[model samples]
Target: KVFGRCELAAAMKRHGLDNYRGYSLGNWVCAAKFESNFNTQATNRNTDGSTDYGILQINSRWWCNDGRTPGSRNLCNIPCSALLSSDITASVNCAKKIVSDGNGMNAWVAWRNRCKGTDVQAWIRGCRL
Candidate 1:
């Protein structure tokens, strides 16, 4: 399912992305914007032979087993396809694990270049938290 800006913000907030690992709710929202545009079925194949999946674009390289990536760790122990669901439960939880593993928002380069150090509040402006 695709989400509107406010829709993603409020949904992510419910999943504990607000202040998760010291990144604000807007940061996560911003990441979603630049990463997958709230597309639950998004996928991007990398030059490294890995693929990113779902809203947060969790990668097959280290997070999920796609039965294709060469060096997949399957660190999240889930099928990469699971991230394509709109539920956001597994997606958010696995994203949390990625952040907790010390990558922080840097796990997503879009977050670093676009969200990090930027005033991401505008991503959720006029939306009720």
Candidate 2:
């Protein structure tokens, strides 16, 4: 899918994404592929009259920027802002933090092992940590 892994790695490093300890690009793609087939624009229409959008199915209503700035740094600040944005790299960073201990890329591993595997709803459950 050519997500600019090198660029992502560099960007992640710049954002302190490597500080977590066990994150990697491969497993990240794994979970993402498992969830949305790497489609950043993926969304789900809930029967409850709700919708999910973006690569990680980020719930826009629940999304926050810089703690309350309202999209200050987009979901990881990817810089794109339509139908999930063209910034897949940025979404990845946000997803990493969202799925992990708010630390490293290994959040992918956590998502797969702890969240995506047993409970698809884990991401939402752990969103506020």
Candidate 3:
């Protein structure tokens, strides 16, 4: 399922992604925009052969266990398939752990490349807190 900009912004804030690890809600919002464009079922095959799953493009190599990934640690201890759900609870929780690990918002490169050092607030220009 895909979420509209306002829909996604409200959802992320509800999950406490707002100001998570020193990053504002807009940071998370922008990351999702660039990563998967708010599509929960998004997936991408990385160069190392592991897959990026869900809205934030959580990686099988590190955050989740795709089972197919070699040497998967599954840090979140969650099934990669679960991240694809539109429910977003798993995605939000995993993202919490990811940032909690001191990686901050850097776990998703898209966040740094597209969200960071940019006008992230623009992502939520019309959304209510």
Candidate 4:
């Protein structure tokens, strides 16, 4: 499920992500774009033998269980496969859990690397929420 930037932004807003947990919709959309290119099913393996899941690229090391990642703490209490759904409900819920736990979007390297200190408004440009 590859969502267009505007579409993703709109959905996020409709889901109340614009100010969820004190994070801006811009921050969420910006980080998700860089992390997974808006692909709800995106997955990537890390150098530490961990994998990231869904649009936010949540880590297997702490958030979800992929069955292959031994000792995964599954802090989000969700199956890694659940994050791959096109619906994005589980993904959004897990992401919210993360932001609340981490106190910010710092849990995502993509946010720190590409979305931080940038003109995040561009991520939601042309989208009406």
Candidate 5:
């Protein structure tokens, strides 16, 4: 569960959340915050102990590790640290990957709305990464 100006800035910068402002960064961050408080290491499970993992809650066990992909492992298998550890460019790319689904940013709109009137420098100062 991460929230703060510095952390926000870092996350944005790390994920290129700025370059595409007026795109989907806000919603992505908003969704992430709502889901996992931005903690890349966060995880959840069902009564049966099935699991979900990380900020985006990538369910590695079933989504990838369940033999869906070639080198799948357990939930949070890649480690939230690894996913969250990415730089801004990487993060943006990751977002694009998720939104576009292997396509490009053809339907992104978050950038144009929530991020439209925002000041990034102030945002960075607020988060104090």
Candidate 6:
């Protein structure tokens, strides 16, 4: 519940993810919107015995520790609960790590499935940033 479209744009700007590493702010916004609806506490259990967490819906298999999954890559090296907070700093940092791992926005299935190649300008349309 930490963000709407405009607020997410502002936060991304503030966090240096607005256009970081060639990914557009709209790309991040669209991913977040479809992933968790900007809800920090969002969680989902995948059929593969993995879980997704936070606004980014990072997978437990690769990013965070949720305890239920064994042998996670734990690439971000943070507990999954850290991402489920109103403070999005850790979540944003982990998202950065995900992108830095060469996955880019394609790391997010929601982005690949929905946001990719879509007209995303409306995500930041009324934002002051």
Maximum-lDDT candidate: 1
Residue 17 of model 1: what lDDT?
A: 88
**Candidate 1 residue pairs in clash (backbone atoms < 3 Å):** none
Q: Write the per-residue lDDT of candidate 6 for residues 11-125, one digit (tens) a residue.
A: 8779988777888899889999999998889999999999999999989998888888987788888999999988888899999998988778888888999999998777888
lDDT of 5 by residue, 1-129 (tens): 455535655666565555453443444555455446666656676454445555555444433242333344443233333444423333344455455453233222333344335552333343433
Cα lDDT of all candidates, in order? Answer: 0.91, 0.46, 0.89, 0.87, 0.46, 0.88
Q: Per-residue error at 51 for model 2, in Å?
A: 2.2
State residue 81's C-alpha deviation in candidate 5, in Å. Answer: 7.0
Ordered from best to worst TM-score, the candidate numbers read 1, 3, 6, 4, 5, 2
Task: List, residue by residue over 58-84, the lDDT tens digit for candidate 4.
Answer: 898988988888877898898999999
Q: How do the residues 1-129 of candidate 1 rate in per-residue lDDT, one tens digit apiece?
A: 999999989999998889988888888999998999889999999999999999999999899999999867998989999999989888999999999997688988999998888899888899988
Steric collisions counted per model: 0, 4, 0, 0, 16, 0
Better of 1 and 5 by TM-score: 1
Candidate 5 structure lDDT: 0.46
The alpha-carbon lDDT assigned to residue 112 of candidate 6 equals 96
Candidate 3 Cα deviation (angstroms), residue 55: 0.3
Measured by TM-score, the strongest candidate is: 1
Worst 10 residues of 1 by lDDT: 101-110
The lDDT, on a scale of 0 to 1, for candidate 1 is 0.91
Which ten contiguous residues of candidate 4 have the minimum total lDDT? 101-110
| Residue runs of model 2 more than 4 Å from their true location after superposition | 1-21, 64-83, 100-129
Q: Note each model's CA RMSD in angstroms.
A: 0.9, 9.9, 1.0, 1.2, 6.9, 1.2
